[PDB]
Design a protein around this ligand. Structure first.
Ligand SMILES: *[C@@H]1O[C@H](CO)[C@@H](O[C@@H]2O[C@H](CO)[C@@H](O[C@H]3O[C@H](CO)[C@@H](O)[C@H](O)[C@@H]3O)[C@H](O)[C@H]2NC(C)=O)[C@H](O)[C@H]1NC(C)=O
Ligand SMILES: *[C@H]1O[C@H](CO)[C@@H](O)[C@H](O)[C@@H]1O
Ligand SMILES: *[C@H]1O[C@H](CO)[C@@H](O)[C@H](O)[C@@H]1O
Ligand SMILES: *[C@H]1O[C@H](CO)[C@@H](O)[C@H](O)[C@@H]1O
Ligand SMILES: *[C@H]1O[C@H](CO)[C@@H](O)[C@H](O)[C@@H]1O
Ligand SMILES: *[C@H]1O[C@H](CO)[C@@H](O)[C@H](O)[C@@H]1O
Ligand SMILES: *[C@H]1O[C@H](CO)[C@@H](O)[C@H](O)[C@@H]1O
Ligand SMILES: *[C@H]1O[C@H](CO)[C@@H](O)[C@H](O)[C@@H]1O
Ligand SMILES: *[C@H]1O[C@H](CO)[C@@H](O)[C@H](O)[C@@H]1O
Ligand SMILES: *[C@H]1O[C@H](CO)[C@@H](O)[C@H](O)[C@@H]1O
Ligand SMILES: *[C@H]1O[C@H](CO)[C@@H](O)[C@H](O)[C@@H]1O
Length: 339
């Protein structure tokens, strides 16, 4: 049972070169050369990866990812005291991924099967953090993402978890301070998020759905989590004039604290909210159970922008959201739900 340690400025290199010879690879204070990826791709089945000390990256305008892992039956963890520091303020310019500097994505969790990622502390990502894709039976456990420095420092589009084309993804105990979605499920099945703390971002959202390879969202559960000081709490966004499916989505035991814009928001006209919502991405079997909290006074409690017939079978129990205005602009609200 081999064990390998890579450190410093040439660690990334050695790591990529010897990873298939190491049952356990320990990354200690590795400084990743600018414009390169920590390539942890295609590890041997069962590999263990330990992040130790402080991981850093050289500065350069590129698209990332800074880190990339793939493989089977993998275990990847963060040692006590470790941190993985993006020092994103080198790139933050207020324009995020839609302009200005090209900023690199942080973590490509692609093509992972039966694997666990836990205890990772990520600090100041340049732009989105976790990109989850084409993965099955993936656990993201006790992850901390602190981009709080970006609040008044031009951080934009710092999504914590972007999910697509994946099944059986479980996210538990995440702590997130950012400036965009805490979670965004673009597609996938059998997804479960529990015990999270989402601060400063744009909420726990399904979507945006439609206009991609995979436009199906099914069996998603958010439970026992807090959304605090964010623009939105509960959000389902489907792209206008697209096709797809959203069904079997549950939000349960959700706490909303000081939500700035929308406590609960469902828009089937996402991408152009000045237009009537379209009907190609129906939302059925939407369940809210014990969602409660506060919206600021200049905010809106609940906004529901559904198309004709494209929203049905919604079960809303114990929903108690208040402090904001009540919208007069909801459309085609399913029975049993209300604004
Ligand atoms: C809707 O999605 C739910 C969450 O993904 C899903 O529950 C989860 O189901 C999986 C698989 O059945 C359970 O995991 C099992 O299989 C692996 C493989 O050996 C074992 O390691 C596990 O111990 C377990 O036996 C999860 O435990 C389970 N998660 C929850 C929170 O209970 C539902 O089955 C999906 N429901 C529908 C109707 O599709
Ligand atoms: C690689 O080297 C480091 C330095 O001791 C260890 O922590 C690790 O377990 C492996 O031996
Ligand atoms: C970082 O730590 C490792 C431990 O094996 C060394 O191999 C390397 O030279 C650097 O000191
Ligand atoms: C190792 O070398 C790299 C690049 O030469 C530095 O960025 C790092 O701080 C360490 O000196
Ligand atoms: C990075 O450094 C290592 C040293 O082991 C090389 O093998 C690799 O090809 C790259 O130059
Ligand atoms: C990466 O690490 C290996 C040994 O761990 C070295 O051989 C190489 O030169 C680079 O520092
Ligand atoms: C990581 O880097 C090594 C050499 O630095 C390659 O051998 C490997 O395929 C991957 O690019
Ligand atoms: C990659 O790292 C391993 C560590 O044992 C070396 O054996 C190899 O030569 C390469 O530098
Ligand atoms: C642990 O696993 C590594 C590869 O994952 C082997 O190189 C080692 O011999 C042991 O089986
Ligand atoms: C390498 O070392 C880690 C932790 O020491 C083990 O979990 C792994 O199985 C391999 O022995
Ligand atoms: C990223 O920027 C560094 C400067 O520190 C270069 O060394 C590297 O080649 C890349 O352009």
């Amino acid at each position: 049972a081999t064990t390998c340690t890579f450190s410093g400025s040439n660690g990334a290199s050695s790591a990529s070169k010897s990873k298939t010879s190491c049952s356990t690879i320990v990354l200690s204070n590795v400084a990743v050369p600018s414009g390169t990826t920590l390539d942890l791709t295609k590890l041997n089945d069962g590999t263990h990866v330990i992040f130790s000390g402080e991981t850093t990256f050289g500065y350069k305008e590129w698209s990332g990812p800074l880190i990339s892992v793939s493989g089977s039956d993998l275990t990847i963890t963060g040692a006590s005291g470790h941190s993985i520091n993006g020092d994103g303020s080198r790139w933050w310019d207020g324009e995020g991924g839609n302009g200005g500097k090209t900023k690199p994505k942080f973590f490509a969790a692609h093509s992972l099967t039966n694997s666990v990622i836990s205890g990772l502390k990520i600090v100041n990502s340049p732009v989105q953090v976790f990109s989850v894709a084409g993965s099955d039976y993936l656990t993201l456990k006790d992850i901390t993402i602190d981009n709080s420095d970006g609040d008044d420092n031009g951080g934009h589009n710092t999504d914590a978890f972007d999910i697509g084309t994946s099944t059986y993804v479980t996210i538990s105990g995440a702590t997130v301070y950012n400036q965009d979605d805490c979670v965004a499920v673009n597609s996938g099945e059998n997804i479960y998020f529990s015990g999270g703390y989402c601060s400063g971002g744009h909420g726990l959202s399904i979507g945006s759905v439609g206009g991609r390879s995979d436009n199906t969202v099914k069996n998603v559960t958010f439970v026992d989590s807090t959304i605090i000081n964010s623009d939105n709490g509960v959000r389902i966004k489907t792209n206008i004039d697209t096709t797809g499916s959203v069904s079997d989505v549950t939000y349960k035991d959700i706490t909303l604290t000081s939500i700035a814009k929308y406590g609960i928001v469902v828009q089937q006209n996402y991408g152009d909210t000045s237009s009537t919502p379209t009907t190609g991405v129906p939302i059925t079997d939407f369940v809210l159970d014990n969602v409660h909290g506060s919206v600021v006074s200049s905010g809106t409690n609940i906004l529901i922008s559904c198309g004709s017939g494209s929203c049905s079978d919604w079960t809303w129990t114990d929903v108690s959201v208040s402090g904001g205005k009540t919208s007069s602009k909801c459309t085609n609200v399913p029975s049993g739900a209300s604004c």
